[PDB]
Design a protein around this ligand. Structure first.
Ligand SMILES: [Mg+2]
Length: 165
């Protein structure tokens, strides 16, 4: 109870919005989100991340990402290794400079996540309201040159229908 109530109080201080979805991926079943030091609200909040590559029909899962990690740092991590998993048209444009990063808002829209921002700072803002989904980050990595087309196809109603309420 002590650990759980501390985490709740620490997350409300950080102004974090959490949206529960009806069919979260099985990789999130354990619900691993924690303060690095469980009895210290100031310690780094650590959450999982789903990294979606919608134009490649692929995604990555990172079990632990610190809130002090920048968007750039996470992009650098997931794109550093051999990029053989991308096997479709436009695979060559998955580099740290050539991609943009998008996140879903509480309204069901999309925001471009600034590469220099920390996840702490993105989740803390009252507006724009960028939530966790099932107590985890969800980001979309899309090449700049495919972004206008991908944003045009984004279905806000379909996004809201993923949610429990
Ligand atoms: Mg917020």
């Amino acid at each position: 109870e002590n650990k759980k109530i501390m985490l709740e109080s620490a997350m409300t201080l950080r102004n974090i919005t959490n949206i529960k979805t009806h069919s979260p991926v099985e990789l999130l079943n354990e619900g691993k989100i924690r303060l690095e030091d469980p009895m210290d609200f100031e310690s780094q909040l650590i959450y999982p991340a789903l990294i979606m590559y919608p134009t490649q029909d692929e995604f990555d899962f990172v079990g632990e990402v610190s809130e002090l990690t920048t968007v750039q740092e996470l992009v650098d991590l997931v794109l550093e290794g051999p990029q053989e998993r991308f096997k479709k048209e436009g695979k060559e444009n998955f580099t740290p400079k050539k991609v943009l990063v998008f996140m879903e808002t509480k309204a069901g829209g999309l925001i471009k996540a600034g590469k220099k921002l920390t996840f702490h700072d993105i989740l803390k803002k009252e507006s724009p309201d960028v939530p966790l989904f099932d107590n985890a980050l969800k980001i979309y990595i899309v090449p700049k040159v495919e972004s206008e087309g991908w944003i045009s196809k984004w279905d806000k109603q379909k996004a809201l229908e993923r949610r429990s309420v």
